[model samples]
Target: MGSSHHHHHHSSGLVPRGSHMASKLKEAAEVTGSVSLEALEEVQVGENLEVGVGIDELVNAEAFAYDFTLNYDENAFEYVEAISDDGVFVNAKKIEDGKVRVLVSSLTGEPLPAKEVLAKVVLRAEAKAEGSNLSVTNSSVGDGEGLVHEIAGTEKTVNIIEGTS
Candidate 1:
């Protein structure tokens, strides 16, 4: 047998004989963009449940935008109103199907720092409300220049019960 055959038999996994394979590990810059929704977790029927939407773990977050869609029964709850946490813009709308859409962002011509409670949605659960929930979809954010940043989000379920919060 050739010497190369002996080398092959004694090769390590990190490298192979007669081959130049480098490590598969490479590095890139860090990513800093995300949105998260706070779970209502538990609330009583016929009570107002406050849901918190937030923009956290962001790098130099100056502005933000996202769609807050609540998957709920048409008559299970009432879309009261949405309140901006602070240093931001907020709006609430009830769609034809009774799904509530909350629009939250920094005020026009004004940007905001990273924050919790991007907006607080006031939802009054009807006596029949059940496992209504909310989610963050089509989420995106911007730096001080309003330029889009790589983003992601996590949503939560809001469970309603027959008792109090």
Candidate 2:
């Protein structure tokens, strides 16, 4: 009489043995890239255009405004030019009557008050082969509170709408 034992073996590097290992790794990377809720709660003052408000500009609540100029790196406009170049496409205007809107135009014009309408200017640039950049300009006229909104990048810009009473 004789007896025998059986065993099984797997090949090396043929397939990952762990369950859902690939999917788990991908999920981890996405989590790292996402903005944190805590970070969003923190007050963000400005964008890449202007990092800090000038000391003189932050003095009081009386609508303070200033002009900001944005310049895109050469050859960087190919991607964003279509949207930015149009005269009024990216310019500013008053949304309501009696609210002075600081306007930006493709053509030069008089400086408008920054009272009720602060123009949220945007300059776009296509990622160039080497160097590229973007710029923003602001102007203010009267002593009134105003809001400025800015968006950039195809996917990361902010858009909002509000109703007035």
Candidate 3:
């Protein structure tokens, strides 16, 4: 009974319990997806326009998390809001005047099903812009297993039509 009253000493750091799964992760097939921008060829100034950001060509990937930057001419277009698919949460914020950081994820860890338009970004034209470019950069898609799929950025041209009123 006297021996049982003594407290046990805790062991310190050890070096042999390491579990490096890097090779296992690399053994899995590469996950990939692509993004495209859809918008009218021209939008009039003082007009609110919607640009669709669609996902496709998915290979071994389900969108548990998505991130990309919307690059545009800030002087020509004013940032509005971005809408996402149901069950998915989208946070769009201006990282810079010309770059809007768009992040999509689910609070419940639900993956976005393979669909056409992942998000609809809205913007208002401010001035007359010729050949204004709307591009997607730093794009990547993540899966539920913490796999990130590298994405190639796509660009679209939408001119801001001159308006009198």
Candidate 4:
């Protein structure tokens, strides 16, 4: 007499261990991108209107020291630039999205108080964008109360109110 038994191992290389699977994913990643959430403003040819879509900024956080970087596609502007008041505070702020990653504490660090208007703004100067990148890279925040806030990541969106020049 004989017996029949065997084992199987997944080695196709498509899946990895500890990966965020479709089934396991319970919630959407926290957002670093901020949308105007308001009605899209109207603009005319030879004029530029800042669509009230998703914006780049950070709100509600504190810490001692840190760095950060964000990215956006042409979907919202022809020429887009990142603007934040924290630029002067951080160790270095480059197109750094150049060194994309958000850090905290220095601006919101221990002794000094955190800025109430902490947010990254993206402006599409002279532009037509149809699509946008929704992922904010290396973003994190901290608090004076001993809590760290890391943006899980988010998708950005845009809407052109009237038309382009």
Candidate 5:
């Protein structure tokens, strides 16, 4: 009778315990590189302007892909078009009102040379403005070994005048 009265009950909530293993691959070192937004000193209103996306300085970087965003004042400039050199794919798409997504890649694994123009973004001056900001942002340079490196963004200013450049 004493053994039957001993009904020891213990209830506990479920405790989940496990370690999550994240996949980590070999990391690549960041290339010391910088991108520049090359613009003219002044652009006339209602005239098409070409802004060059050039590599300022790159060391040991054979880039297979160059992706970035060109930011500008929408009130002062309107995007017209974008073009690149031969044997490469280049596109400039207006992601938002003032942000243009520029993507450059080579399908044949051809690498981009240093201190060259990756792409030229064409825009039209919309209004007469001074000291307008033009910048490169979200820039990433991808090498041939499936490794990506970040490039420093650059900024430039251009005056939108009433006359020609």
Candidate 6:
């Protein structure tokens, strides 16, 4: 007769996700730039607002979020879009080939005393159980050119455009 003995083993088994994990990690990041205005009560038109962000390693990250904000005059008209190095437009309406425009009407653009126009854009990237890295550039254009406007924001577990390794 033979007796049976019970034994247990402990190990860590890792599973690999699909390519979608990497794609989900890529998202729009914060933008940084400046705008210009004529008077205190005038609308500040942003020109050449350069926004960009980069990630060294996000190959299969779990979750990420990027936020951006633009400051201007409440009464002044405001516009935000994406542009290429050669002055090409890129965005939801215009994807890398056309121009996308977002205009705030005068009624909705009523200027507020001691109040600044604040606009925020956010991008969310999520993965199942993997990690990944991504980079994105956002640009804003408006009535004026060579004017000074500012685009600023923050990122969690990500990198800003023109960021270093």
TM-scores for candidates 1 onward, in order: 0.61, 0.24, 0.73, 0.39, 0.73, 0.20
Best by lDDT: 5
Task: Give stretches of model 1 more than 4 Å off.
Answer: 1-32, 64-70, 96-98, 106-110, 163-165
Instruction: List per-prediction Cα lDDT, in the order shown.
Output: 0.63, 0.26, 0.72, 0.39, 0.74, 0.25
- What TM value does model 2 have? 0.24
lDDT of 2 by residue, 1-165 (tens): 657576455446757565643443333211111110111111111222211111122223333233333333333222111112222223333232212223332222332222222233322212222223222323222223443322111112221112232
Q: For residue 49, what is the lDDT in candidate 5? A: 72
Report per-prediction Cα RMSD to one decimal. Answer: 13.2, 23.2, 8.7, 11.6, 13.2, 22.2
Name the candidate, 3 or 5, with the larger lDDT value: 5
Query: Model 4 residue 68 lDDT?
Result: 43
Give RMSD (Å) of candidate 4 vs. truth: 11.6
lDDT of 4 at 153: 41
Model 3 lDDT per residue over 33-141, tens place: 6786666758889887776676756678776777777887788888777777666667788778867887777665556664455666666788767788788866788
Off by over 4 Å in 6: 1-107, 111-117, 128-138, 144-165
Write one digit per residue (lDDT tens) for candidate 5, span 26-109: 676546788866667578787777777867776656677888788877887887767777766778888776678888876555
lDDT of 4 by residue, 1-165 (tens): 767577455446667668653666576544353322222333332344332222234455433333345454443444333233443243223443212333333333243233332344343433444344334445445544555555444445444343533
Per-residue lDDT value at 109 in model 4: 29
lDDT per residue for candidate 6 within 60-151, as digits (tens), equals 22111112232221122222452222222123222221123222211233221111222211222111111112122232323122222233
Lowest lDDT sum, 10 consecutive residues, model 5, at: 1-10
The list of candidate 2 runs beyond 4 A from truth reads 1-57, 64-67, 78-131, 135-141, 145-165
TM-score computed on alpha carbons, candidate 4: 0.39
Model 3 Cα displacement at 32 (Å)? Answer: 3.6
How many steric overlaps does candidate 4 have? 27
Instruction: Quote the lDDT for 35 in model 4.
Output: 25
